[PDB]
Each structure stands twice: as C-alpha cells, then as structure tokens.
DNA sequence: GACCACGGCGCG
DNA sequence: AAAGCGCGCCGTGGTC
C-alpha cells in the first residue's frame, strides 16, 4: 500500500530483491525494488537499476552485494535487519522467521521485501536501543564484516579441476575393489550405501554383535564408532570402513566440486552465512569450504586441489590452541595461563599421553587426534565414550578426565558460574556480549537439562573465538587491499589469503601480526602461518 | 521435479 | 553409540 514512485529511489532507501536461486554468484536478478518515506520504487530492468544504488541496505544485503560484485559493481552492503535480529537472538536465522517475529511477512516480491526491510529495520533498531554491547558488535563487527564476506564470496578460490577428475577415476577403481571384497565376505551383493541393508548383513546374517542403536528409530547402528569397535570380529568391517571413507570423499568433494567452477571467474565460490549459528560462528555452504578434508592421505590429496592463481601464493593463518587460550582468559585459571605464557602445547601433550611417545615424537596425525580428545573432554564427553575412542579401560578414561580438569582447577569454577548466571538471565554471553538464549537450564528431565548445560558453557568459549576472528577479518581486510592481496576463506579460526608472489612474505607477516594483536587477552594469541601453491602445502 | 527425515560423517 | 559443542552435505528411503 506504499505510494508507487518512479525509479530511482532516494539515497538510503531499503532494497528488496528476488533471485532465481539462493546463491548470489549463480542467480539471475529477477526483480529489484526500493522503499523509503512511504514510497516503494520498482526497477524497470533490475540489472541496469543496480547501477543507481550506492549501497545495499536491507534484508540479505550481502547477497545482493555479491551479485553486484559479480557484475563489476561496487555496491557494499550496509544495514541488514537480519544482522540486528541475529545479535538480539541468534535463533533469528532466516527472513521467514524474523518477519513473523518482528512484524511482517517474507514474500517472493521485491517490493514487498523492500517494504518489509524498512519496517523490520525500524522495529529491530528500536529493540536494540540501549543494548550498547550488541550495538557495538553490530557497528564494529557484523555490519563491516558483511562487506568483507561479500568480497570473499565474489573472489572465490582456484581449484585444480583436471587433478580432481583424474583422482575420481583412481578412487573409483579402489571403491570397486573394496566393494567386490565386501560382497564376497558377505556372500552376495547388496547396496553398501544403504545402512538398512548393511545392518541386516552385519547383525542378522554374519551374527556380529550390535553395540549401539540409532537415535530416532532404534535401529542397530552401523556408525564408524560401532564398526571400529568390532573391526577384528570380522574383516568385512575393515573393508566397509575403507569403502565408507572413499565414497564419502568422492561423493562430497571429488565429484561435485569440479562442476561448480563459475564461467566468468574460473573459480569456486562458497557462501559465508553470517546469521546461521547459535554461537556467532560463520558457516559456509553451496559448497561448504569449511569442511574440506585434511585428516587422511586421500583427504590431503583433495585439499591439494585448492591452489593459488598463477603468479600468486596462498597464505594460511591458523590460531594456535585457540579455544584453550580463550578459556584461559575467560576462566582466569592461573595454570592454564602459565601454559601459554610458557609456550606449551596441550594438543601435543595429550598426544604424548595418548600414543606414549615423547612430545618431540608426536607427529601431525597424532596431534590432530589429541584435539577431539582435548575439546571432547573440556566440553563434557563421557568416560564411557572416551574409554571407547581411546581404546582404554573405563577406569583409565575417568582418570584422564579427572586429571585434565584438576590440572586447570579454575575451569570447573568458570563452568558453574557460567551456568548459574545462565539460569538466572536465561542466556549466556561471549567476552564481547554476544548472547545465546538457553532455556532448559532448569528443565526437569535430567538428560535435557545436562544437554542444555553443555550447549550453554560451550557458547562463551566458541563464540568469543568467533568474535575474535571476525574482528581480525574486519581489521585485516583494508590492509590486504592496500597490499594487493585477497582474502578467500575463513574456516573458524583460520584465514586463507591469496597474495602476489612478490608480496606474499610481507602479507604473511602482516596478517599474523593483525590476527595476534586483534584484542590483547590475559594470554598471548599465537598464529601459525604458512605459504604455498596449495592449501595443504600452505599449512606446513 | 519438489519436499523431508534419518543416519552418517567431513571440518572447526 | 556413549554426558563433547558448532556446522552442511551425502545417499537412502519415503511422500506429493
Ligand atoms: N574437534 C574439535 C576441533 C576444533 N574445535 C574448536 C576448538 C579449537 O580451538 C577451534 C579451532 O580448531 P583447530 O583445529 O584450529 O584447533 P586449535 O586451534 O585448538 O589447534 P591448532 O593449534 O592445531 O590450531 O575449534 C572443537 O571444538 N572441536
Ligand atoms: Mg587453530
Ligand atoms: Mg583451524
Ligand atoms: Mg541431521
């Protein structure tokens, strides 16, 4: 019911837009509208009308900004009601839900989206009047970060497509050998990808023991953890786990990624979703480039396909022991602080215990394993689970958990203060005041309450680490531009950059310093930096 | 074609 | 699977 006005809109109007599909790098811009001052302006031809905007201001601003960047236009994102709602409550993840919560409807019409953006901005900006810590997060982190993310998304990353095509052919041959061996040991063929058929074979036909059951339907589970258990109670299991590895990698990375190269960039473009997680982390999708393989030799082969443009180098920067350092700061544990002031490495230390070798003997595959144990235990893994992953007696696992925490005695104190203030206020918060609402801290079913507790005390540590990385991205991005380097990926506590070969060294030193200095804590932040033609060689 | 739930699993 | 947390994507199996 807004007065139809002629295009263009006045400066500072709210934009609405419709995409043929959710990925801005692939979408056709179907319709473009703007709203301000009781007027809605609808664009005659959406692509041309992009040239008239000075900024993208409205719901999903970053997506329109990426599509503008793809078309050679600098149209930075500004205000986005989604960002306001997400700071108020990170359960606010989609326009559909935000619109109904704060007074409107997310439709499929640009003009209605424009009007909705204007109202939703007014209401939410008012709900934020007075929330000085959240306002600071919005102005100094989330709103400027969206500009960085738009540039990352539009830049993309070079992928060695030919290499991966070749790899698909080798991997397929190994899958068919493993499959043939599985069928032989079972005495007939069947779909190894059907967990239902595999369950029957393993537990009915071959009589193997069934260790555990699935959550929703109570089937006998065929998970890696259950199969690792009985990995000698039959050799078929050995093969199935290998088949699972290869097919996971082929179907998720090797085959799909080469078909996602963009015609106009020649590169691979992810999306960095800014209002997607309960803790303040980013997520990555279409495709997810935050879960590229790294653990196994085949995974590393896949990771080697992510390469630098000709004449450039990749620079990979990864915070050291990051959530332990954050925990040191948040809890104030004297022993934990000392650890890092002394340059100790808890992942290496735990790996030493796990595999029984001196710390100078811990290799990379060993240290990485220690990480799940270290964060497993910190965030509340059960002795039974630990016992089974480490392959030690139950009593040895309880003992490790007890020693872990008694090493750093103020941590349990910090957990209980976090939970207690979380029961009273209904949310928990990061160092910078980012909040997560956690009801159920007072639930009357113990299992439900204890799950809420593990959610609640993880969020301040994981979310503070997320705040620190976002703030560093915001500080680092202008310096990279001035140096002619590019930011490509964020993987929670890691940045991957692309830099001209002749500046790569200065870029690495500079990026390390900004990341280490982003916000001084009671413990040094240390960053490991590597340079290489490919993502794997850049982390060594 | 489009959904979706589930078990499962890659990374942080 | 189990008292780690946070994600997104796969294939299967099922429905419309
Ligand atoms: N299994 C894991 C792995 C990671 N993380 C969290 C805590 C880590 O600190 C953070 C970053 O992951 P990294 O793999 O980079 O681990 P670290 O930063 O702690 O160790 P490293 O010194 O190897 O970088 O993500 C987690 O909760 N559980
Ligand atoms: Mg790290
Ligand atoms: Mg990392
Ligand atoms: Mg699921």
Write structural notes for this entry.
The PDB classes it as transferase. Keywords: DNA polymerase, transferase. It forms a trimeric assembly. The entry is titled "Crystal structure of KlenTaq mutant M747K in a closed ternary complex with a dG:dCTP base pair". The protein is DNA polymerase I, thermostable. The protein has 540 residues and is an alpha+beta fold. The protein has four domains: 1-154, Nucleotidyltransferase, domain 5 (2-Layer Sandwich), CATH 3.30.420.10; 155-271, Taq DNA Polymerase, Chain T, domain 4 (Up-down Bundle); 272-321 and 466-538, Alpha-Beta Plaits, CATH 3.30.70.370; 322-465, no CATH class. The protein is built from 20 helices and 14 strands. The protein has helices at residues 46-49, 61-70, 81-88, 95-102, 110-127, 132-155, 161-186, 195-205, 224-229, 235-254, 297-303, 322-331, 334-341, 346-355, 364-378, 383-390, 394-407, 410-425, 446-483, 504-516, and strands spanning 3-5, 14-19, 29-36, 39-42, 158-159, 271-273, 283-285, 306-307, 312-319, 427-429, 435-437, 486-490, 494-500, 527-532. The strands form five sheets. A four-stranded mixed sheet has the order 1-4-3-2. Strands 12-13-9-14 form a four-stranded antiparallel sheet. Helix 3 (81-88) packs parallel to helix 5 (110-127), helix 3 crosses helix 6 and helix 12 (322-331) packs across helix 19 (446-483). The radius of gyration is 25 Å and the shape is globular. The chain binds a DNA duplex (12 and 16 nucleotides) through helix 8, helix 9, helix 10, strand 7 and helix 15.
């Amino acid at each position: 019911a807004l007065e139809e006005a002629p295009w263009p809109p006045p400066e500072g109007a709210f934009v609405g837009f419709v995409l043929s599909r959710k990925e801005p790098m692939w979408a056709d811009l179907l319709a473009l509208a703007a709203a301000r001052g009781g007027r809605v302006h609808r664009a005659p031809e959406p692509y041309k009308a992009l040239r008239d905007l000075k900024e993208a201001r409205g719901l999903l601003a970053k997506d329109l900004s990426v599509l503008a960047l793809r078309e050679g236009l600098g149209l930075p994102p500004g205000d986005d009601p989604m960002l306001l709602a997400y700071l108020l409550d990170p359960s606010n993840t989609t326009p559909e839900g935000v619109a109904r919560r704060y007074g409107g409807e997310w439709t499929e019409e640009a003009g209605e989206r424009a009007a909705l953006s204007e109202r939703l901005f007014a209401n939410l900006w008012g709900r934020l009047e007075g929330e000085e810590r959240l306002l600071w997060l919005y102005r100094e982190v989330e709103r400027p970060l969206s500009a960085v993310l738009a540039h990352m998304e539009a830049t993309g990353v070079r992928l060695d497509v030919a290499y991966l095509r070749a790899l698909s052919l080798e991997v397929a041959e190994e899958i068919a050998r493993l499959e043939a061996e599985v069928f032989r040991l079972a005495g007939h063929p069947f779909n190894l990808n059907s967990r239902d058929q595999l369950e029957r074979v393993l537990f009915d036909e071959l009589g193997l023991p069934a260790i555990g059951k699935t959550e929703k339907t109570g089937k006998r589970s065929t998970s890696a953890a259950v199969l690792e258990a009985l990995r000698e109670a039959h050799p078929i299991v050995e093969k199935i786990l290998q088949y699972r590895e290869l097919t996971k990698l082929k179907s998720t990375y090797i085959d799909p990624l080469p078909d996602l190269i963009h015609p106009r960039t020649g590169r691979l473009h992810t999306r960095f979703n800014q209002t997607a997680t309960a803790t303040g982390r980013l997520s990555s999708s279409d495709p997810n480039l935050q879960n590229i393989p790294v653990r196994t030799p085949l995974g590393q082969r896949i990771r080697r396909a992510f390469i630098a443009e000709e004449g450039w180098l990749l620079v990979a920067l990864d915070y050291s022991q990051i959530e332990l350092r954050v925990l040191a700061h948040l809890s104030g544990d004297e022993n934990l602080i000392r650890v890092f002031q002394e340059g100790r490495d808890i992942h290496t230390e735990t790996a030493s215990w796990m595999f029984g070798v001196p710390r100078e003997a811990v290799d990379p595959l060993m240290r990485r394993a220690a990480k799940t144990i270290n964060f497993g235990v910190l965030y509340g893994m059960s002795a039974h689970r630990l016992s089974q992953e480490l392959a030690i007696p139950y009593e040895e696992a309880q003992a490790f958990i007890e020693r872990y925490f008694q090493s750093f005695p103020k941590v349990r104190a910090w957990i209980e203060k976090t939970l207690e203030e979380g029961r009273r206020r209904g949310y928990v918060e990061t160092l910078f005041g980012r909040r997560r609402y956690v009801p159920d801290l007072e639930a009357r079913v113990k299992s439900v309450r204890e799950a809420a507790e593990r959610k609640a005390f993880n969020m301040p540590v994981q979310g503070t680490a997320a705040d620190l990385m976002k703030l560093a991205m915001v500080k680092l991005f202008p310096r990279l531009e001035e140096m002619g380097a590019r930011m490509l990926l964020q993987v929670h506590d890691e940045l991957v950059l692309e830099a001209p070969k002749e500046r790569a060294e200065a870029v690495a030193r500079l990026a390390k310093e900004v990341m280490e200095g982003v916000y001084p804590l009671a413990v040094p932040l240390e960053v490991e930096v590597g340079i290489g033609e490919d993502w794997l060689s850049a982390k060594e």
